[PDB]
A paper describes a structure:
The γ-tubulin ring complex (γ-TuRC) acts as a structural template for microtubule formation at centrosomes, associating with two main compartments: the pericentriolar material and the centriole lumen. The GCP proteins interact via their N-terminal GRIP1 domains in a specific order: the γ-TuRC core harbors four pairs of GCP2/GCP3 (spoke 1–8), followed by a sequence of vertebrate-specific paralogs GCP4/GCP5/GCP4/GCP6 (spoke 9-12) and finally another pair of GCP2/GCP3 (spoke 13-14). The inside of the γ-TuRC is lined by a lumenal bridge composed of one actin molecule, as well as two α-helical modules formed by the microprotein MZT1 (mitotic-spindle organizing protein 1) and the N-terminal extensions of GCP3 and GCP6 (N-GCP3 and N-GCP6), respectively.
After having structurally characterized the universal γ-TuRC adapter protein NEDD1, we next focused on the conformational plasticity of pericentriolar γ-TuRCs imaged in purified human centrosomes. In the first class, the overall conformation is similar to the isolated vertebrate γ-TuRC, and spokes 13 and 14 are positioned outwards from the helical axis (outwards conformation of spokes 13 and 14). In both classes, prominent GCP2-associated densities decorate the outside of the γ-TuRC. Examining the distribution of CM1 modules on our γ-TuRC structures, we unexpectedly observed CM1 modules in two distinct patterns, highly correlating with the overall γ-TuRC conformation. In the outwards conformation, density for CM1 modules could be detected exclusively on spoke 13.
Author numbering:
A (entry chain R): 8 to 21, 28 to 41, 50 to 84, 89 to 101
B (entry chain S): 12 to 36, 40 to 54, 56 to 72
C (entry chain Q): 24 to 36, 40 to 53, 56 to 72
D (entry chain P): 3 to 16, 30 to 49, 66 to 80, 82 to 97, 107 to 118
E (entry chain U): 2 to 39, 50 to 375
The structure:
Amino acid sequence: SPNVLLQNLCCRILVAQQFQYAVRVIGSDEFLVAEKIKKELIRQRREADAALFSELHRKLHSQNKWSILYLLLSLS
Amino acid sequence: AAAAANLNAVRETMDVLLEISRILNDMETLSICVRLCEQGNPEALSSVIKELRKATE
Amino acid sequence: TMDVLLEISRILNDMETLSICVRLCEQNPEALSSVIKELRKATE
Amino acid sequence: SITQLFDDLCEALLRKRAKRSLKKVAYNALFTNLARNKILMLSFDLRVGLGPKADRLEELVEELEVGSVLDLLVQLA
Amino acid sequence: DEEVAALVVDNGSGMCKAGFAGDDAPRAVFPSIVGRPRKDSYVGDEAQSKRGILTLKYPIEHGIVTNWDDMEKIWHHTFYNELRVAPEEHPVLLTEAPLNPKANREKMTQIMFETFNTPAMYVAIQAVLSLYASGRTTGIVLDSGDGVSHTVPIYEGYALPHAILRLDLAGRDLTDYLMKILTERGYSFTTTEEREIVRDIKEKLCYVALDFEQEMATAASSSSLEKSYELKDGQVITIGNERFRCPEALFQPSFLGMEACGIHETTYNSIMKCDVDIRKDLYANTVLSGGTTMYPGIADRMQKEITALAPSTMKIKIIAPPERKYSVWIGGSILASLSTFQQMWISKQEYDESGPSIVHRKCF
Ligand SMILES: Nc1ncnc2c1ncn2[C@@H]1O[C@H](COP(=O)(O)OP(=O)(O)O)[C@@H](O)[C@H]1O
């Protein structure tokens, strides 16, 4: 299942060599992440967006979470 | 009934995640990434995505 | 060539059966795998 | 011939009556029935579970690069 | 086992093959001939042995039954003389030529149930059985026998009648052509007895040259292709370019005064008559069957010739099973032995219920 999902992600991003490299790479808290995101937003500033992000984070909890936030922060 | 409620919750969560991505900045790529993140690590996935983007360029 | 194929088969999982299977393939593949599984069940 | 090869395969899996029954079962199975990316996916699963063995399998596949045979092997696995 | 043995009978234009389903080879093979004085009727080898005092009849001369009275006698002979079984006690799988008239199929059915009282029967196309024997359900079969040759495209087990081609050029014509060129060489093979000798020379020393002209040049400037053949009286004769000139007629019928396309061109034409979506499957699965495809070198020659006719991007593969001389019979033995085929037999009950025409529905 996970391997199939990784192959689908590689296809969306784009071949076989790239998929093999991705497989090799794969083979190779929440509050802190939120604070880091706010600090990154401050560096970018801006302030209004940070307030909106705090409201959005609360909404997600109302409707694992740390891993998704970390990936988004890395993309920046 | 219960299945329909679960589908609505998933759609609402996806919309909220997309808004967060836009602020820190597609939807199909985000859905694939979210499923992979739920299974299991996060830093490694980000590195692979960055490498794939460089290859596309 | 044949020796390399045998090593790959061992990792995935005799030698005479692999040689016979290779000759049949040279002479579909999914159907052959199903037949081998059925033969193993019959032997059991 | 192809028919002779099928009989030889049945004998290896396996007195004369028993061999005939095995051949009939193989023929029935064949009637009922009537690549590189897949190998990489199997390697990724092995790496998650080991890593050295997965690297050797990838190297062997590269050396080989038949395809049909490989596919069959994968299926068997 | 609860079931009695089922019979497999391959009706050939020159030779009939009979045996029991499940066996690897036919138990008997005999000439498709019936003879009466110039014991009242002679069938098979005996008719041939005593042809001197008989008038011979060939009821299935070109693959299609033309005289049912004598065909019935051939079947009677098959059961009681060759196989030594009672037809009313065994299901019978019979073979038929490609493009066999619908009325003939009903006749065969009626004769089996009403004359021989078979408990069950079925009829399958010869080419289809040969394809089955090769482990395939899709492909094109080039069947060359004694009195006729056919190119039969088959997809998913079904022959495609619109694309089937018949070539009235086979083993018989090649035997007579060899008699003719050996006579032109300086020998003399003209009598019926001599025809049998040449047929033997043909089956033992002939071959298909990869390149006709080059082979002719080699034979003209050296004795490297010559082979000796000893007659029963001890005389040893020499066969040179006749070895490959004989079967060359399959590729160039003009050598026989025929305007027909050779076997390679006929195979190509059949494929071209099929839906474009399955042509690649046919090109990749061209199977040879029949005694006349036994010539050494024929597979490589077909590969070369088809490759020249087909698109350069096409994958061409000629399959020539070592046992192709009896692949029709073997395919029947395999089919009649299949678990899923048992429900396909036409039972005496079904025959009594629907009559002869049921064969069209049951044996599509
Ligand atoms: N080895 C061989 N080489 C060439 N021709 C052969 C060989 N063996 C048999 N034949 C020829 O094949 C023909 C018979 O083949 P077969 O498929 O049994 O025909 P049919 O079914 O029409 O009677 C005869 O003309 C015979 O001479």
